[PDB]
Ligand binder design. Structure first.
Ligand SMILES: COc1cc(O)c(C(=O)N2Cc3ccccc3C2)cc1C(C)C
Length: 213
């Protein structure tokens, strides 16, 4: 048979759609904090599975290794983050990545117009959107125990898609692929990735491996 795959198209909650616009169509220095934000979500999802793990070891039969991979590809112009954390069910994605309103959205947008540092993004509960400071498209692949694997993808423009993922399986965790803008290729550079990591991510308690082409 010719392949047939299922897709669902969603609208970003109105206010999150505003934030994303602000984020993309405005200039901010200190963009490197996007990598700090990624690594912290990865680290939080890793905490989660490890906590569940204390009580139910079979929770790890989908993966015993707790770590975070970094993978820049200049050919594709992608920076990919990979962790072996808790993962996301379908609901988690939909409710966490765009559909549902965030308490922090209105305040953060205001704080930015008042001249606040883009770096505050995380504090206001919307740090995942820091990805659009450097990326024109973002793909999120995730696998949670007792559920299937999903792909979530957006180029912003107020919309996003979700689909049961047929691609390469990950046992468990989330993978985030950032398709960098052209002015932001500096984040595909090994030297700059190590510099950002060593500066902003030294509190992280899981090994970070950087794969270098
Ligand atoms: C790198 O971006 C991510 C990495 C992730 O592992 C995760 C993730 O799967 N989780 C689950 C979880 C559970 C408790 C607390 C936080 C989180 C985030 C998410 C992202 C971003 C796409 C938000």
């Amino acid at each position: 048979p010719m392949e047939e795959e299922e897709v669902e198209t969603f609208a970003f909650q109105a206010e999150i759609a505003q934030l994303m616009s602000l984020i993309i169509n405005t200039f901010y220095s200190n963009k490197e904090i996007f990598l700090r934000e990624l690594i912290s979500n990865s680290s939080d999802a890793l905490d989660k599975i490890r906590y569940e793990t204390l009580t139910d070891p079979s929770k790890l039969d989908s993966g015993k290794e707790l770590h975070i991979n970094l993978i820049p590809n200049k050919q594709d112009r992608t920076l990919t983050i990979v962790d072996t954390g808790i993962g996301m069910t379908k609901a988690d994605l939909i409710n966490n990545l765009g559909t549902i309103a965030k308490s922090g959205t209105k305040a953060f947008m205001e704080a930015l117009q008042a001249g606040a540092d883009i770096s505050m993004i995380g504090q206001f509960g919307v740090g995942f959107y820091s990805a659009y400071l450097v990326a024109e498209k973002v793909t999120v692949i995730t696998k949670h125990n007792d559920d299937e694997q999903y792909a979530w993808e957006s180029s912003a423009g107020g919309s996003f898609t979700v689909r049961t993922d047929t691609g390469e399986p990950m046992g468990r965790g989330t993978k985030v692929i950032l398709h960098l803008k052209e002015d932001q290729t500096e984040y595909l550079e090994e030297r700059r990735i190590k510099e950002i990591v060593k500066k902003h991510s030294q509190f992280i308690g899981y090994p970070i491996t950087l794969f270098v082409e």
